[PDB]
Curated annotation (Swiss-Prot), chain A:
The chain holds residues 282 to 405 of 1819 of the full protein. Component of the gamma-tubulin ring complex (gTuRC) which mediates microtubule nucleation. The gTuRC regulates the minus-end nucleation of alpha-beta tubulin heterodimers that grow into microtubule protafilaments, a critical step in centrosome duplication and spindle formation. It is found in: Cytoplasm, Cytoskeleton, Microtubule organizing center, Centrosome. Belongs to the TUBGCP family. It is linked to Microcephaly and chorioretinopathy, autosomal recessive, 1: A syndrome characterized by microcephaly, cognitive impairment, underdeveloped retina and choroid, and epilepsy in some patients. The more anterior parts of the retina, near the periphery and pars plana, have a grayish hue and diminutive vasculature similar to retinopathy of prematurity. Visual impairment becomes evident during the first year of life. This is Gamma-tubulin complex component 6. It comes from Homo sapiens. Disulfide bonds: none annotated.
From Swiss-Prot, chain C:
Belongs to the MOZART1 family. This is Mitotic-spindle organizing protein 1. The chain holds residues 11 to 75 of 82 of the full protein. The lineage of its organism: Eukaryota, Metazoa, Chordata, Craniata, Vertebrata. It comes from Homo sapiens. It is found in: Cytoplasm, Cytoskeleton, Microtubule organizing center, Centrosome; Cytoplasm, Cytoskeleton, Spindle. Keywords: Acetylation, Cytoplasm, Cytoskeleton. The keyword Cell division does not apply. The keyword Hydrolase does not apply. One of its GO terms (biological process) is microtubule nucleation by interphase microtubule organizing center. Required for the recruitment and the assembly of the gamma-tubulin ring complex (gTuRC) at the centrosome. The gTuRC regulates the minus-end nucleation of alpha-beta tubulin heterodimers that grow into microtubule protafilaments, a critical step in centrosome duplication and spindle formation. Associates with the gamma-tubulin ring complex (gTuRC) consisting of TUBGCP2, TUBGCP3, TUBGCP4, TUBGCP5 and TUBGCP6 and gamma-tubulin TUBG1 or TUBG2; within the complex, interacts with TUBGCP3 and TUBGCP6 to form a luminal bridge with actin that stabilizes the initial structure during complex assembly. Interacts with TUBG1. GO terms for cellular component: centrosome; cytosol; gamma-tubulin ring complex; interphase microtubule organizing center; spindle.
Swiss-Prot record, chain D:
Belongs to the TUBGCP family. The lineage of its organism: Eukaryota, Metazoa, Chordata, Craniata, Vertebrata. It comes from Homo sapiens (Human). GO terms for molecular function: gamma-tubulin binding; microtubule binding. This is Gamma-tubulin complex component 5. The chain holds residues 210 to 496 of 1024 of the full protein. Keywords: Cytoplasm, Cytoskeleton, Microtubule. GO terms for biological process: cytoplasmic microtubule organization; meiotic cell cycle; microtubule nucleation; mitotic cell cycle; spindle assembly.
UniProtKB/Swiss-Prot annotation, chain E:
Belongs to the TUBGCP family. Ubiquitously expressed. Keywords: Cytoplasm, Cytoskeleton, Intellectual disability, Microtubule, Primary microcephaly. It comes from Homo sapiens (Human). Its main location: cytoplasm. It is found in: Cytoplasm, Cytoskeleton, Microtubule organizing center, Centrosome. It is linked to Microcephaly and chorioretinopathy, autosomal recessive, 3: A disorder characterized by congenital microcephaly and chorioretinal dysplasia associated with poor vision and nystagmus. Variable ocular anomalies include microphthalmia, retinal folding, retinal detachment, optic nerve hypoplasia, absence of retinal vessels, round areas of chorioretinal atrophy, and attenuated electroretinogram. Most patients have mild developmental delay and mild learning difficulties. This is Gamma-tubulin complex component 4. The keyword Ubl conjugation does not apply.
Length: 105, 116, 65, 255, 176, 100
């Protein structure tokens, strides 16, 4: 049982603060490194900051949503020149979306 | 868990047979381990240390005998073992040389000069 | 936890020290048998009693060979 | 809670922010030499009066040094106080007591000023000599591969233990090649006319190969070929096309 | 503790060891947390680091005073002789990471072989500075110490002698 | 005074180094401390008194180049043996913090 549990993944980092049981803890990844969860955190935070700096009359939730592929297929249907799910034919997605919808309009 | 089925785990490791494939050996195992369970002789980790040294002299090694003392240090620094005498006496008894009279050489006492 | 994985590191440390002593003497035991023998020796057992068994079970696999 | 919990767990923030910290550890001489030495000194009654420090660990300093040597300037630690980059004094690591540390980071900062100046020389081309243009091109060719080595060591802070003695011996064959650049860059600025200021520099390379006539020589060769490139063109233009050329008289042989 | 000594033996003393230019890394500071007599063990150990500091200062200026391409061949072999002292400094740190009870005595023990390489070549660098030898008579002074009497300095200088002759086979190829 | 101070000192006179409560009595006489335990220690410090002579001889004769190749090699062998002795001594030092 102990040798069965003993085969656990252990960090190859060894501490410089502790020589008494150094299993590491890590050097704790920066905001520059981690970028799909801290990216969402930063996106939510700057969105809320801008909404405060206007007052609360801007209102863009969701740092992403719906997905990536869904929006691309939506825009693919915009180039047919007919209806889609976001037109009838961060929050900076709209600036990205306008020039790629205006091709099909 | 109980010690008796743990003996059968040993029996699965050493034999190619499973524990369910043999019961003649497990009979003998129940004969030997029972009534000689729980130490009945005087313990000494020191004599075991000097006899693992004495065995490494028989392999014509003096470097590995003083590295063994550092492993003996590390053994105590972790301190999770209950009988450090027993497992090292056990590995020393099962030692095989890679390549007379010794009952007049120092051993552990029987505790039949002492109430148990 | 975290401090419960440090103890799971401190048992691998011991097991490596015992694994070193098992090879510099060139015993018959392998690492898997040895993990049963550590459990037996933790309870308090005569090491004179187990070794006679192990001396017979290794000749009982020459009664298998 | 929401973002602050993610900060407090997953991210460090203790030297960048002027926010002091203490770290709990097992301590026991092998990693508590700094505090042990501090207690020794305090018991002798100096009379205390310590410096202001914010407590940064060892591994943060590694990433700051690798950033400095890659060629990016103006960081939080190794910030200029005379024009030369110098290590901050808010640093105590829980062993070494910051006396070995100030010496090793001081030598590394002395290294950082030399590459700081060269990246500044490349910077002042982002905002007709034709030999300077071919000079910063070779300097750049050293810098891309060098920066790659630094960034690779930066990755291995993210995914095993790294320490000071690893980065020094790993960057041994680059600190050899840097000493060449300190001598070559001094002759491209020492000089009135553009053709003497180019010939002094180009003659330094032709002499510096023969000074050592083996890894500095491959560096000197790679710096030599990409700097005689304007001259092969201008001599070939004078030979096969006949007519004389001016570039503010950049070319060597006037008729 | 585990990196203070493994930089002090290198070119960074710290505050535990005070460099004297005549001969440095001085320690006599009484230790309640080690021993009063541990300073002597350390003083025996400091003999190595002083040699290494002088050797690195010697290699820094090269590659009246001395000159020649032969000084750009002698220091180059002096780089390779100190290389098993650099790997054997990494391994000590690697051992010190886990072991909680190890002390200075392990280092003093483990680097007792380098109390034979380092002094016997330290006298050579002093001989080449006090008498101005920089020439092809460097080969004589290395070839008489390659005969030696201690096995480290017997095999170290042969590697140096070969690289000095390597430059001597580019001159005598251009000539011949 | 407790035994633990003297044990630390005795473990240093194996190297041939004066402890804090054990120092050399004379150049040709075994160490003096600065009932049975007190009597035992002189026997153990005999090893350091003997070791000082051999070490001081193989220190100077290794570096003497008017001594010839033969014999500087003898010092190489003499030194190579003393290494193996401090292999014991390193473990002996580290096991502090039984031991007697």
């Amino acid at each position: 049982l102990w040798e069965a549990a003993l085969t656990y993944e252990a960090s190859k980092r060894r501490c410089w603060e502790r020589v008494g049981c150094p299993p590491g803890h890590r050097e704790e990844p920066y905001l520059t490194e981690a970028g799909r969860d801290a990216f969402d955190k930063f996106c939510r935070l700057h969105q809320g900051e801008l909404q405060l700096l206007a007052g609360g009359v801007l209102q863009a939730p969701q740092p992403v949503l719906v997905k990536e592929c869904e929006l691309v297929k939506d825009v693919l249907n915009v180039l047919i020149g007919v209806v889609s799910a976001t037109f009838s034919l961060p929050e900076s997605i709209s600036s990205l979306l306008s020039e790629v919808a205006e091709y099909g309009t | 868990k109980s010690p008796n089925v743990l003996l059968q785990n040993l029996c699965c490791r050493i034999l190619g047979r499973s524990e369910a494939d043999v019961a003649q050996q497990f009979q003998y195992a129940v004969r030997v381990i029972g009534s000689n369970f729980a130490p009945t002789v005087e313990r000494d980790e020191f004599l075991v240390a000097e006899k693992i040294k004495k065995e490494l002299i028989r392999q014509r090694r003096e470097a590995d005998a003083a590295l063994f003392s550092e492993l003996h240090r590390k053994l105590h620094s972790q301190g999770v073992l209950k009988n450090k005498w027993s497992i090292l006496y056990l590995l020393l008894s099962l030692s095989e040389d890679p390549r007379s009279y010794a009952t007049l050489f120092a051993q552990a006492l029987p505790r039949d000069a002492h109430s148990t | 936890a975290a401090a419960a994985a440090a103890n799971l590191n401190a048992v691998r440390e011991t097991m490596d020290v015992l694994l070193e002593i098992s090879r510099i003497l060139n015993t018959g035991l392998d690492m898997e048998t040895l993990s049963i023998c550590v459990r037996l020796c933790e309870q308090g057992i005569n090491p004179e009693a187990l070794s006679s068994v192990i001396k017979e079970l290794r000749k009982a696999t020459e009664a298998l060979k | 809670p929401d973002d602050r919990s993610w900060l407090e767990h997953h991210v460090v923030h203790q030297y960048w922010t002027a926010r002091p910290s203490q770290f709990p550890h097992s301590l026991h001489l092998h990693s508590n030499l700094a505090a042990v030495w501090d207690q020794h000194l305090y018991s002798s009654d100096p009379l205390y009066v310590p410096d202001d420090r914010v407590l940064v660990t060892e591994t943060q300093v590694i990433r700051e040094t690798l950033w400095l040597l890659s060629g990016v300037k103006k960081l939080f630690i190794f910030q200029l106080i005379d024009g030369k980059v110098t290590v901050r004094n808010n640093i105590i690591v829980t062993h070494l007591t910051h006396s070995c540390l100030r010496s090793v980071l001081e030598q590394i900062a002395a290294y950082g000023q030399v590459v700081f100046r060269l990246q500044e020389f490349i910077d002042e081309v982002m905002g007709p000599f034709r030999t300077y243009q071919a000079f910063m091109w070779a300097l750049y060719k050293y810098f891309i591969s060098f920066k790659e080595e630094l960034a690779e060591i930066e990755k291995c802070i993210i995914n095993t233990t790294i320490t000071l003695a690893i980065v020094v011996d790993k960057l041994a064959p680059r600190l050899s090649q840097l000493k060449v650049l300190h001598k070559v860059f001094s002759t491209g600025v020492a000089e009135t006319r553009n053709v003497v200021r180019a010939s002094h520099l180009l003659n330094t390379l032709y002499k510096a190969i023969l000074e050592y006539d083996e890894q500095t020589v491959s560096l000197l060769f790679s710096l030599w070929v990409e700097t005689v490139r304007p001259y092969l063109q201008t001599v070939d233009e004078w030979i096969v096309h006949g007519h004389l050329w001016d570039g503010a008289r950049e070319f060597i042989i006037q008729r | 503790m585990i990196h203070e000594l493994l930089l002090a033996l290198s070119g960074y003393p710290g505050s535990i060891f005070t460099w004297n230019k005549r001969s440095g890394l001085q320690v006599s500071q009484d230790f309640p947390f080690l021993h009063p007599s541990e300073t002597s063990v350390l003083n025996r150990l400091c003999r190595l680091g002083t040699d290494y500091i002088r050797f690195t200062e010697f290699i820094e200026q090269y590659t009246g005073g001395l000159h020649g391409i032969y000084l750009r061949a002698f220091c180059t072999g002096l780089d390779s002789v100190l290389q098993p002292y650099r790997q054997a400094l990494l391994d000590l740190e690697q051992e010190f990471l886990g072991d909680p009870h190890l002390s200075i005595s392990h280092v003093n023990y483990f680097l007792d072989q380098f109390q034979l390489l380092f002094p016997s070549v330290m006298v050579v660098v002093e001989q080449i500075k006090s008498q101005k030898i920089h020439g092809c008579q460097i080969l004589e002074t290395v070839y008489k110490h390659s005969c030696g009497g201690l096995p480290p300095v017997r095999s170290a200088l042969e590697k140096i002698l070969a690289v000095c002759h390597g430059v001597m086979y580019k001159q005598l190829s251009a000539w011949m | 005074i407790t035994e633990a101070a003297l044990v630390r000192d005795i473990l240093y006179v194996f190297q041939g180094i004066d402890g804090k409560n054990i120092k050399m009595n004379n150049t040709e006489n075994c160490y003096k401390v600065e009932r049975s335990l007190r009597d035992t220690a002189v026997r153990l410090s005999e090893l350091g008194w003997l070791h000082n002579k051999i070490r001081r001889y193989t220190d100077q004769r290794s570096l003497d180049r008017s001594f010839g190749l033969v014999g500087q090699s003898f010092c190489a062998a003499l030194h190579q043996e003393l290494r193996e002795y401090y292999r014991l001594l390193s473990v002996l030092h580290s096991q502090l913090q039984s031991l007697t």
